[PDB]
Amino acid sequence: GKYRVYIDQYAKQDYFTVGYKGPNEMDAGIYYAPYVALTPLRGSDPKNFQPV
Amino acid sequence: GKYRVYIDQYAKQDYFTVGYKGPNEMDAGIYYAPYVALTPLRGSDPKNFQPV
Amino acid sequence: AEIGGDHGYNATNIAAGQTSGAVTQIGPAVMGMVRRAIPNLIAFDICGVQPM
Amino acid sequence: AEIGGDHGYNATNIAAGQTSGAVTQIGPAVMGMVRRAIPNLIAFDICGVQPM
Amino acid sequence: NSPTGQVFALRAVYGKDPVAAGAKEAFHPMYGPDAMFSGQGAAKKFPALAAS
Amino acid sequence: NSPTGQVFALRAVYGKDPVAAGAKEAFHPMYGPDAMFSGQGAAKKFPALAASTQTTVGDIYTHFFQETGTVYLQASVQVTIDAGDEDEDEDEDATDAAKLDAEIKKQMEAGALVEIAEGMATSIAELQEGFNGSTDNPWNEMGFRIDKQVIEAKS
Amino acid sequence: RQLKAAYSIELAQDLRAVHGMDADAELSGILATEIMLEINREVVDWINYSAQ
Amino acid sequence: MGFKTRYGIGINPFAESAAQAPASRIQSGMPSILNSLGKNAYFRRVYVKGI
């Protein structure tokens, strides 16, 4: 009834970590602010034409 | 009504050849196998903007 | 006399269909392709986002 | 970079599908099999056909 | 439709091992049939003609 | 239905050359993602952690774990991995490569090093591969390779 | 964060002919998935970094 | 009177999950000393004592 458990795949020795997350996005203790989404880019070299 | 004649435009000397071609595309001697048609490509040099 | 024989159990000969017997095989039959499964994520909701 | 390269134009490599680049091939496509035509028989109306 | 292609060729040979070196094609368009292969030849070996 | 079979296997490989030997796989289930390749890895090449290596506070070290791939650690205190103590301590059997991992875990356990993933400086990532007249700053590239396995039939 | 890939035109043409994989989405999918994994891994590592 | 039959045993690729690259881009799928002799990750056996 209280805790959501996320299992760390690549743990080295062993541990458990407990934290808090309120409804407001400021009740985190760590902020992930994506300034720009994943921007795709493409180009070519006009001597081999191979897509990059 | 037995031979079909083709002309070598760039014939380095006067000559003729006789060959065979059966009904099926197998018994023909030399096999010509296209893979990819002429694929156009386009590009430009960044330092001088000259299309290639 | 018209024996089947077998490939020399070499991956090189097995792939190419080369056999020690009389008939040369077409080649191995494809059974499908295997690839790694993309790893999952931690649902990213343990920390607030607040995008910039 | 991520290039395909080619087979070394070697008979063993081509049938086995082993290239020199990143991707290994299944095997060359089958273009059919060519048998040998049975030569004809020059009748029997030029000699006796007396059965024993 | 593939980067490589293969063509099969079938031959008919004379006697025992099909892949033994020095064999002879059975239904050769140029070479005449071994008319004594199944006849008197199967009972005795004839001398090989040679110069002098 | 034929006395010969084959199955292909696709793999994703770091680095620009997916055929060069000694190139770690991308999505290995036990090898965790190298969380510096798209980040600081392109800009700065961290020195590999090794036995008998003095750690300077505020620096980053890297090492490959036999069980969980790649980890980048930050030195919080000046410590020596194995030149102090151990050295000739009594152990029944362990690979000197495997012995290193236990020591690193012990240091990580005692709050000396901490696992850290970093982004990349905005200036450097912008001036990547010769732009503006910069030099010697190649990108990081990924490729895939396809390799086959073949079986036959006994009797 | 940033990544890039480059593939030859021959590789793209060959792969689709023999395996049906376009070698463009695969490279695009791999780069997009790799960066997201690290970002997801980085956030988790920061929490274990700053946890009391 | 006699009987005949033919079968084939082939290992699954990735069974040696621990090595990130194959051997020579082409290898025999039938089991061998190098292919799988304690390296196949799909299986794990445990000995029990004092049962």
Side-chain angles (χ1 to χ4, degrees), chain E residues 5-52:
Chain E
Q6 57 189 342
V7 179
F8 286 105
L10 172 140
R11 320 170 94 89
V13 286
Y14 271 106
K16 272 292 183 61
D17 184 295
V19 308
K24 298 184 301 181
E25 189 177 17
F27 295 165
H28 202 275
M30 305 181 58
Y31 306 144
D34 193 325
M36 277 178 164
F37 184 83
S38 58
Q40 182 63 25
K44 58 195 299 296
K45 294 187 60 179
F46 291 155
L49 203 51
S52 70

mmCIF file of all heavy atoms in Angstrom, chain E residues 5-52:
data_model
loop_
_atom_site.group_PDB
_atom_site.id
_atom_site.type_symbol
_atom_site.label_atom_id
_atom_site.label_comp_id
_atom_site.label_asym_id
_atom_site.label_seq_id
_atom_site.Cartn_x
_atom_site.Cartn_y
_atom_site.Cartn_z
ATOM 1 N N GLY E 5 24.936 -14.707 -57.066
ATOM 2 C CA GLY E 5 24.092 -15.705 -57.682
ATOM 3 C C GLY E 5 24.895 -16.947 -58.005
ATOM 4 O O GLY E 5 26.113 -16.898 -58.190
ATOM 5 N N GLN E 6 24.187 -18.069 -58.068
ATOM 6 C CA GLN E 6 24.806 -19.359 -58.315
ATOM 7 C C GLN E 6 24.033 -20.109 -59.388
ATOM 8 O O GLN E 6 22.818 -19.949 -59.528
ATOM 9 C CB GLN E 6 24.873 -20.195 -57.038
ATOM 10 C CG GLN E 6 23.534 -20.416 -56.383
ATOM 11 C CD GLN E 6 23.660 -21.059 -55.023
ATOM 12 O OE1 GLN E 6 24.692 -21.637 -54.691
ATOM 13 N NE2 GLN E 6 22.609 -20.955 -54.221
ATOM 14 N N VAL E 7 24.756 -20.927 -60.150
ATOM 15 C CA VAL E 7 24.188 -21.729 -61.226
ATOM 16 C C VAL E 7 24.698 -23.153 -61.075
ATOM 17 O O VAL E 7 25.898 -23.367 -60.873
ATOM 18 C CB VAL E 7 24.554 -21.172 -62.614
ATOM 19 C CG1 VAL E 7 23.962 -22.039 -63.703
ATOM 20 C CG2 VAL E 7 24.071 -19.742 -62.757
ATOM 21 N N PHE E 8 23.792 -24.121 -61.171
ATOM 22 C CA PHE E 8 24.139 -25.528 -61.044
ATOM 23 C C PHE E 8 24.320 -26.160 -62.415
ATOM 24 O O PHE E 8 23.590 -25.844 -63.358
ATOM 25 C CB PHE E 8 23.067 -26.291 -60.269
ATOM 26 C CG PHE E 8 23.072 -26.011 -58.804
ATOM 27 C CD1 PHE E 8 22.100 -25.213 -58.238
ATOM 28 C CD2 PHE E 8 24.051 -26.548 -57.991
ATOM 29 C CE1 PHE E 8 22.106 -24.954 -56.888
ATOM 30 C CE2 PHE E 8 24.062 -26.291 -56.644
ATOM 31 C CZ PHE E 8 23.089 -25.494 -56.091
ATOM 32 N N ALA E 9 25.291 -27.060 -62.514
ATOM 33 C CA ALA E 9 25.534 -27.828 -63.723
ATOM 34 C C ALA E 9 25.604 -29.305 -63.371
ATOM 35 O O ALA E 9 26.298 -29.692 -62.427
ATOM 36 C CB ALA E 9 26.825 -27.389 -64.412
ATOM 37 N N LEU E 10 24.886 -30.125 -64.132
ATOM 38 C CA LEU E 10 24.842 -31.564 -63.922
ATOM 39 C C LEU E 10 25.515 -32.271 -65.086
ATOM 40 O O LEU E 10 25.335 -31.886 -66.244
ATOM 41 C CB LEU E 10 23.402 -32.061 -63.772
ATOM 42 C CG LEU E 10 23.180 -33.573 -63.733
ATOM 43 C CD1 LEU E 10 22.128 -33.915 -62.700
ATOM 44 C CD2 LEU E 10 22.761 -34.092 -65.096
ATOM 45 N N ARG E 11 26.286 -33.307 -64.775
ATOM 46 C CA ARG E 11 26.959 -34.111 -65.781
ATOM 47 C C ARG E 11 26.706 -35.583 -65.494
ATOM 48 O O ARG E 11 26.375 -35.969 -64.371
ATOM 49 C CB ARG E 11 28.469 -33.839 -65.809
ATOM 50 C CG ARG E 11 28.840 -32.378 -65.642
ATOM 51 C CD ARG E 11 30.331 -32.206 -65.427
ATOM 52 N NE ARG E 11 31.040 -31.939 -66.671
ATOM 53 C CZ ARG E 11 31.242 -30.726 -67.164
ATOM 54 N NH1 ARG E 11 30.795 -29.646 -66.545
ATOM 55 N NH2 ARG E 11 31.909 -30.592 -68.306
ATOM 56 N N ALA E 12 26.858 -36.402 -66.527
ATOM 57 C CA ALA E 12 26.784 -37.850 -66.404
ATOM 58 C C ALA E 12 28.136 -38.430 -66.785
ATOM 59 O O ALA E 12 28.709 -38.050 -67.811
ATOM 60 C CB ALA E 12 25.679 -38.427 -67.289
ATOM 61 N N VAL E 13 28.648 -39.337 -65.961
ATOM 62 C CA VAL E 13 30.002 -39.842 -66.114
ATOM 63 C C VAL E 13 29.963 -41.332 -66.436
ATOM 64 O O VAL E 13 28.905 -41.957 -66.489
ATOM 65 C CB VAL E 13 30.856 -39.572 -64.867
ATOM 66 C CG1 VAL E 13 31.221 -38.105 -64.790
ATOM 67 C CG2 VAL E 13 30.096 -39.998 -63.635
ATOM 68 N N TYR E 14 31.145 -41.900 -66.647
ATOM 69 C CA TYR E 14 31.309 -43.297 -67.037
ATOM 70 C C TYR E 14 32.065 -44.044 -65.942
ATOM 71 O O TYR E 14 33.268 -43.840 -65.758
ATOM 72 C CB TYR E 14 32.055 -43.401 -68.363
ATOM 73 C CG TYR E 14 31.180 -43.377 -69.592
ATOM 74 C CD1 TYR E 14 31.116 -42.254 -70.399
ATOM 75 C CD2 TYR E 14 30.443 -44.491 -69.961
ATOM 76 C CE1 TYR E 14 30.329 -42.235 -71.530
ATOM 77 C CE2 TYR E 14 29.650 -44.479 -71.088
ATOM 78 C CZ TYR E 14 29.597 -43.349 -71.870
ATOM 79 O OH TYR E 14 28.809 -43.332 -72.996
ATOM 80 N N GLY E 15 31.362 -44.909 -65.219
ATOM 81 C CA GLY E 15 32.029 -45.888 -64.384
ATOM 82 C C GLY E 15 32.318 -45.489 -62.953
ATOM 83 O O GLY E 15 33.058 -44.534 -62.700
ATOM 84 N N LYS E 16 31.735 -46.232 -62.010
ATOM 85 C CA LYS E 16 32.077 -46.151 -60.593
ATOM 86 C C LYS E 16 32.016 -44.738 -60.031
ATOM 87 O O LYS E 16 30.940 -44.144 -59.925
ATOM 88 C CB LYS E 16 33.474 -46.730 -60.358
ATOM 89 C CG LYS E 16 33.499 -48.226 -60.111
ATOM 90 C CD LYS E 16 32.845 -48.570 -58.785
ATOM 91 C CE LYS E 16 32.929 -50.057 -58.497
ATOM 92 N NZ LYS E 16 34.340 -50.522 -58.418
ATOM 93 N N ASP E 17 33.174 -44.199 -59.670
ATOM 94 C CA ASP E 17 33.233 -42.943 -58.937
ATOM 95 C C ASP E 17 32.914 -41.777 -59.863
ATOM 96 O O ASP E 17 33.591 -41.606 -60.882
ATOM 97 C CB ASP E 17 34.609 -42.762 -58.312
ATOM 98 C CG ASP E 17 34.700 -41.518 -57.451
ATOM 99 O OD1 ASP E 17 34.588 -40.400 -57.995
ATOM 100 O OD2 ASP E 17 34.875 -41.660 -56.223
ATOM 101 N N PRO E 18 31.910 -40.956 -59.549
ATOM 102 C CA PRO E 18 31.596 -39.832 -60.442
ATOM 103 C C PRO E 18 32.632 -38.726 -60.404
ATOM 104 O O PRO E 18 32.874 -38.082 -61.431
ATOM 105 C CB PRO E 18 30.231 -39.350 -59.931
ATOM 106 C CG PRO E 18 29.709 -40.466 -59.076
ATOM 107 C CD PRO E 18 30.915 -41.103 -58.479
ATOM 108 N N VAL E 19 33.259 -38.484 -59.251
ATOM 109 C CA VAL E 19 34.181 -37.365 -59.107
ATOM 110 C C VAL E 19 35.633 -37.782 -59.251
ATOM 111 O O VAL E 19 36.528 -36.945 -59.070
ATOM 112 C CB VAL E 19 33.973 -36.644 -57.761
ATOM 113 C CG1 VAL E 19 32.510 -36.284 -57.578
ATOM 114 C CG2 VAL E 19 34.469 -37.503 -56.614
ATOM 115 N N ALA E 20 35.898 -39.046 -59.564
ATOM 116 C CA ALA E 20 37.270 -39.487 -59.764
ATOM 117 C C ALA E 20 37.896 -38.750 -60.940
ATOM 118 O O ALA E 20 37.266 -38.559 -61.983
ATOM 119 C CB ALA E 20 37.315 -40.995 -60.000
ATOM 120 N N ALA E 21 39.143 -38.326 -60.762
ATOM 121 C CA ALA E 21 39.835 -37.579 -61.800
ATOM 122 C C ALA E 21 40.040 -38.443 -63.038
ATOM 123 O O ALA E 21 40.227 -39.659 -62.953
ATOM 124 C CB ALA E 21 41.181 -37.071 -61.286
ATOM 125 N N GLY E 22 39.999 -37.798 -64.201
ATOM 126 C CA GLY E 22 40.145 -38.502 -65.456
ATOM 127 C C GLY E 22 38.882 -39.128 -65.996
ATOM 128 O O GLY E 22 38.960 -39.925 -66.936
ATOM 129 N N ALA E 23 37.722 -38.804 -65.431
ATOM 130 C CA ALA E 23 36.465 -39.350 -65.914
ATOM 131 C C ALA E 23 36.100 -38.722 -67.258
ATOM 132 O O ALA E 23 36.809 -37.865 -67.791
ATOM 133 C CB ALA E 23 35.360 -39.126 -64.887
ATOM 134 N N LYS E 24 34.977 -39.163 -67.819
ATOM 135 C CA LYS E 24 34.525 -38.687 -69.118
ATOM 136 C C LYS E 24 33.025 -38.441 -69.082
ATOM 137 O O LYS E 24 32.272 -39.239 -68.520
ATOM 138 C CB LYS E 24 34.863 -39.689 -70.226
ATOM 139 C CG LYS E 24 36.352 -39.929 -70.407
ATOM 140 C CD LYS E 24 36.624 -40.849 -71.580
ATOM 141 C CE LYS E 24 35.939 -42.190 -71.394
ATOM 142 N NZ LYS E 24 36.230 -43.109 -72.527
ATOM 143 N N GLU E 25 32.598 -37.336 -69.686
ATOM 144 C CA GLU E 25 31.181 -37.008 -69.706
ATOM 145 C C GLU E 25 30.432 -37.958 -70.629
ATOM 146 O O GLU E 25 30.914 -38.312 -71.707
ATOM 147 C CB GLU E 25 30.970 -35.563 -70.151
ATOM 148 C CG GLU E 25 29.536 -35.083 -69.998
ATOM 149 C CD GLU E 25 29.360 -33.625 -70.374
ATOM 150 O OE1 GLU E 25 30.251 -33.067 -71.047
ATOM 151 O OE2 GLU E 25 28.329 -33.035 -69.992
ATOM 152 N N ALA E 26 29.238 -38.367 -70.200
ATOM 153 C CA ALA E 26 28.491 -39.385 -70.929
ATOM 154 C C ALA E 26 27.861 -38.828 -72.198
ATOM 155 O O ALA E 26 28.167 -39.276 -73.306
ATOM 156 C CB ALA E 26 27.415 -39.990 -70.026
ATOM 157 N N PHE E 27 26.974 -37.852 -72.053
ATOM 158 C CA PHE E 27 26.216 -37.329 -73.187
ATOM 159 C C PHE E 27 26.891 -36.108 -73.797
ATOM 160 O O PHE E 27 26.284 -35.052 -73.951
ATOM 161 C CB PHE E 27 24.796 -37.006 -72.748
ATOM 162 C CG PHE E 27 24.001 -38.207 -72.336
ATOM 163 C CD1 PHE E 27 22.827 -38.059 -71.626
ATOM 164 C CD2 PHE E 27 24.421 -39.482 -72.669
ATOM 165 C CE1 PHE E 27 22.089 -39.157 -71.250
ATOM 166 C CE2 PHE E 27 23.686 -40.585 -72.294
ATOM 167 C CZ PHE E 27 22.518 -40.422 -71.584
ATOM 168 N N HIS E 28 28.159 -36.247 -74.156
ATOM 169 C CA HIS E 28 28.905 -35.099 -74.640
ATOM 170 C C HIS E 28 28.426 -34.706 -76.035
ATOM 171 O O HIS E 28 28.292 -35.565 -76.911
ATOM 172 C CB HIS E 28 30.398 -35.397 -74.667
ATOM 173 C CG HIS E 28 31.251 -34.171 -74.629
ATOM 174 N ND1 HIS E 28 31.575 -33.455 -75.760
ATOM 175 C CD2 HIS E 28 31.841 -33.529 -73.595
ATOM 176 C CE1 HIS E 28 32.333 -32.427 -75.425
ATOM 177 N NE2 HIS E 28 32.509 -32.449 -74.116
ATOM 178 N N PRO E 29 28.146 -33.422 -76.268
ATOM 179 C CA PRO E 29 27.690 -33.018 -77.607
ATOM 180 C C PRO E 29 28.753 -33.190 -78.672
ATOM 181 O O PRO E 29 28.424 -33.496 -79.824
ATOM 182 C CB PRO E 29 27.306 -31.547 -77.411
ATOM 183 C CG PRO E 29 28.160 -31.097 -76.279
ATOM 184 C CD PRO E 29 28.286 -32.274 -75.358
ATOM 185 N N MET E 30 30.024 -33.006 -78.322
ATOM 186 C CA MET E 30 31.114 -33.159 -79.280
ATOM 187 C C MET E 30 31.636 -34.592 -79.303
ATOM 188 O O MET E 30 31.649 -35.240 -80.353
ATOM 189 C CB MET E 30 32.250 -32.188 -78.944
ATOM 190 C CG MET E 30 31.825 -30.738 -78.847
ATOM 191 S SD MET E 30 33.209 -29.643 -78.490
ATOM 192 C CE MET E 30 34.285 -30.010 -79.870
ATOM 193 N N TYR E 31 32.071 -35.091 -78.151
ATOM 194 C CA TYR E 31 32.671 -36.413 -78.075
ATOM 195 C C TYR E 31 31.630 -37.497 -78.318
ATOM 196 O O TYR E 31 30.497 -37.414 -77.839
ATOM 197 C CB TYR E 31 33.325 -36.611 -76.710
ATOM 198 C CG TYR E 31 34.305 -35.523 -76.346
ATOM 199 C CD1 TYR E 31 34.428 -35.085 -75.038
ATOM 200 C CD2 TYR E 31 35.101 -34.926 -77.312
ATOM 201 C CE1 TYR E 31 35.317 -34.088 -74.700
ATOM 202 C CE2 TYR E 31 35.996 -33.930 -76.983
ATOM 203 C CZ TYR E 31 36.099 -33.514 -75.675
ATOM 204 O OH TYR E 31 36.988 -32.521 -75.341
ATOM 205 N N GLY E 32 32.023 -38.521 -79.069
ATOM 206 C CA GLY E 32 31.150 -39.632 -79.352
ATOM 207 C C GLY E 32 30.952 -40.521 -78.145
ATOM 208 O O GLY E 32 31.777 -40.555 -77.227
ATOM 209 N N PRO E 33 29.846 -41.257 -78.119
ATOM 210 C CA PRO E 33 29.593 -42.158 -76.995
ATOM 211 C C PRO E 33 30.565 -43.323 -76.994
ATOM 212 O O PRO E 33 31.056 -43.755 -78.039
ATOM 213 C CB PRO E 33 28.158 -42.632 -77.242
ATOM 214 C CG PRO E 33 28.013 -42.570 -78.715
ATOM 215 C CD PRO E 33 28.809 -41.369 -79.157
ATOM 216 N N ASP E 34 30.839 -43.833 -75.798
ATOM 217 C CA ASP E 34 31.666 -45.027 -75.641
ATOM 218 C C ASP E 34 30.809 -46.214 -76.056
ATOM 219 O O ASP E 34 30.159 -46.862 -75.235
ATOM 220 C CB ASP E 34 32.169 -45.154 -74.209
ATOM 221 C CG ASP E 34 33.278 -46.178 -74.063
ATOM 222 O OD1 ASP E 34 33.252 -47.202 -74.776
ATOM 223 O OD2 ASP E 34 34.180 -45.959 -73.227
ATOM 224 N N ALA E 35 30.810 -46.501 -77.358
ATOM 225 C CA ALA E 35 29.896 -47.494 -77.908
ATOM 226 C C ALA E 35 30.155 -48.896 -77.378
ATOM 227 O O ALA E 35 29.247 -49.731 -77.412
ATOM 228 C CB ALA E 35 29.983 -47.492 -79.432
ATOM 229 N N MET E 36 31.364 -49.179 -76.899
ATOM 230 C CA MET E 36 31.695 -50.488 -76.355
ATOM 231 C C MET E 36 31.729 -50.504 -74.836
ATOM 232 O O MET E 36 32.155 -51.501 -74.248
ATOM 233 C CB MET E 36 33.038 -50.966 -76.905
ATOM 234 C CG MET E 36 32.954 -51.619 -78.266
ATOM 235 S SD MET E 36 34.585 -52.085 -78.855
ATOM 236 C CE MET E 36 34.166 -53.208 -80.178
ATOM 237 N N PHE E 37 31.295 -49.424 -74.186
ATOM 238 C CA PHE E 37 31.364 -49.361 -72.730
ATOM 239 C C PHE E 37 30.502 -50.442 -72.093
ATOM 240 O O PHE E 37 30.931 -51.122 -71.154
ATOM 241 C CB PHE E 37 30.933 -47.979 -72.249
ATOM 242 C CG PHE E 37 31.054 -47.792 -70.772
ATOM 243 C CD1 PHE E 37 32.264 -47.439 -70.207
ATOM 244 C CD2 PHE E 37 29.960 -47.966 -69.948
ATOM 245 C CE1 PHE E 37 32.382 -47.264 -68.850
ATOM 246 C CE2 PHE E 37 30.070 -47.793 -68.589
ATOM 247 C CZ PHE E 37 31.283 -47.443 -68.038
ATOM 248 N N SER E 38 29.284 -50.614 -72.590
ATOM 249 C CA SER E 38 28.371 -51.617 -72.066
ATOM 250 C C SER E 38 28.431 -52.931 -72.829
ATOM 251 O O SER E 38 27.703 -53.865 -72.482
ATOM 252 C CB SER E 38 26.938 -51.083 -72.085
ATOM 253 O OG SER E 38 26.554 -50.726 -73.400
ATOM 254 N N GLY E 39 29.274 -53.029 -73.852
ATOM 255 C CA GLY E 39 29.344 -54.236 -74.649
ATOM 256 C C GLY E 39 30.612 -55.036 -74.440
ATOM 257 O O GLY E 39 30.926 -55.438 -73.317
ATOM 258 N N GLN E 40 31.348 -55.272 -75.528
ATOM 259 C CA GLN E 40 32.562 -56.075 -75.451
ATOM 260 C C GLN E 40 33.599 -55.444 -74.532
ATOM 261 O O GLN E 40 34.423 -56.157 -73.948
ATOM 262 C CB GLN E 40 33.142 -56.271 -76.852
ATOM 263 C CG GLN E 40 34.392 -57.125 -76.905
ATOM 264 C CD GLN E 40 34.146 -58.544 -76.441
ATOM 265 O OE1 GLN E 40 33.025 -59.046 -76.508
ATOM 266 N NE2 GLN E 40 35.196 -59.200 -75.964
ATOM 267 N N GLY E 41 33.570 -54.119 -74.383
ATOM 268 C CA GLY E 41 34.538 -53.460 -73.524
ATOM 269 C C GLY E 41 34.460 -53.916 -72.082
ATOM 270 O O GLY E 41 35.483 -53.998 -71.398
ATOM 271 N N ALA E 42 33.256 -54.224 -71.601
ATOM 272 C CA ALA E 42 33.089 -54.665 -70.224
ATOM 273 C C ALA E 42 33.721 -56.023 -69.954
ATOM 274 O O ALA E 42 33.865 -56.395 -68.786
ATOM 275 C CB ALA E 42 31.605 -54.711 -69.863
ATOM 276 N N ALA E 43 34.097 -56.767 -70.992
ATOM 277 C CA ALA E 43 34.710 -58.076 -70.814
ATOM 278 C C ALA E 43 36.229 -58.045 -70.871
ATOM 279 O O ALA E 43 36.877 -58.857 -70.205
ATOM 280 C CB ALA E 43 34.191 -59.053 -71.873
ATOM 281 N N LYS E 44 36.814 -57.134 -71.645
ATOM 282 C CA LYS E 44 38.262 -57.051 -71.760
ATOM 283 C C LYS E 44 38.656 -55.606 -72.018
ATOM 284 O O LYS E 44 37.861 -54.805 -72.513
ATOM 285 C CB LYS E 44 38.784 -57.960 -72.877
ATOM 286 C CG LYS E 44 38.192 -57.658 -74.241
ATOM 287 C CD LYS E 44 38.457 -58.786 -75.224
ATOM 288 C CE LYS E 44 39.944 -59.009 -75.434
ATOM 289 N NZ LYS E 44 40.605 -57.829 -76.054
ATOM 290 N N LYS E 45 39.900 -55.280 -71.682
ATOM 291 C CA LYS E 45 40.433 -53.939 -71.875
ATOM 292 C C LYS E 45 41.248 -53.911 -73.160
ATOM 293 O O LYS E 45 42.187 -54.697 -73.321
ATOM 294 C CB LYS E 45 41.295 -53.510 -70.689
ATOM 295 C CG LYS E 45 40.530 -53.347 -69.390
ATOM 296 C CD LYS E 45 41.414 -52.747 -68.308
ATOM 297 C CE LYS E 45 41.927 -51.374 -68.716
ATOM 298 N NZ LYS E 45 42.781 -50.763 -67.661
ATOM 299 N N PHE E 46 40.889 -53.011 -74.064
ATOM 300 C CA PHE E 46 41.596 -52.913 -75.327
ATOM 301 C C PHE E 46 42.848 -52.054 -75.179
ATOM 302 O O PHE E 46 42.883 -51.127 -74.368
ATOM 303 C CB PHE E 46 40.688 -52.322 -76.395
ATOM 304 C CG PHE E 46 39.569 -53.225 -76.797
ATOM 305 C CD1 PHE E 46 38.401 -52.710 -77.320
ATOM 306 C CD2 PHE E 46 39.686 -54.594 -76.650
ATOM 307 C CE1 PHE E 46 37.372 -53.545 -77.690
ATOM 308 C CE2 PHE E 46 38.659 -55.434 -77.020
ATOM 309 C CZ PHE E 46 37.500 -54.909 -77.540
ATOM 310 N N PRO E 47 43.891 -52.348 -75.951
ATOM 311 C CA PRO E 47 45.115 -51.548 -75.868
ATOM 312 C C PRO E 47 44.881 -50.122 -76.334
ATOM 313 O O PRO E 47 44.016 -49.849 -77.169
ATOM 314 C CB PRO E 47 46.083 -52.285 -76.798
ATOM 315 C CG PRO E 47 45.200 -53.010 -77.751
ATOM 316 C CD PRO E 47 44.000 -53.420 -76.954
ATOM 317 N N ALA E 48 45.667 -49.207 -75.777
ATOM 318 C CA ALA E 48 45.553 -47.792 -76.100
ATOM 319 C C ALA E 48 46.438 -47.463 -77.294
ATOM 320 O O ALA E 48 47.644 -47.724 -77.273
ATOM 321 C CB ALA E 48 45.941 -46.929 -74.900
ATOM 322 N N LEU E 49 45.834 -46.889 -78.329
ATOM 323 C CA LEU E 49 46.577 -46.534 -79.527
ATOM 324 C C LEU E 49 47.527 -45.380 -79.240
ATOM 325 O O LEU E 49 47.207 -44.467 -78.475
ATOM 326 C CB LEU E 49 45.615 -46.160 -80.651
ATOM 327 C CG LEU E 49 46.159 -46.285 -82.069
ATOM 328 C CD1 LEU E 49 46.771 -47.656 -82.263
ATOM 329 C CD2 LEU E 49 45.046 -46.052 -83.072
ATOM 330 N N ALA E 50 48.702 -45.423 -79.859
ATOM 331 C CA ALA E 50 49.706 -44.388 -79.654
ATOM 332 C C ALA E 50 50.635 -44.364 -80.857
ATOM 333 O O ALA E 50 50.628 -45.270 -81.692
ATOM 334 C CB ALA E 50 50.492 -44.617 -78.360
ATOM 335 N N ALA E 51 51.432 -43.303 -80.937
ATOM 336 C CA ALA E 51 52.406 -43.180 -82.011
ATOM 337 C C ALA E 51 53.474 -44.258 -81.888
ATOM 338 O O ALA E 51 53.837 -44.672 -80.783
ATOM 339 C CB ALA E 51 53.053 -41.797 -81.988
ATOM 340 N N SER E 52 53.978 -44.709 -83.038
ATOM 341 C CA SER E 52 54.999 -45.755 -83.107
ATOM 342 C C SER E 52 54.536 -47.023 -82.393
ATOM 343 O O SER E 52 55.250 -47.601 -81.571
ATOM 344 C CB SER E 52 56.334 -45.263 -82.542
ATOM 345 O OG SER E 52 56.258 -45.090 -81.138
#
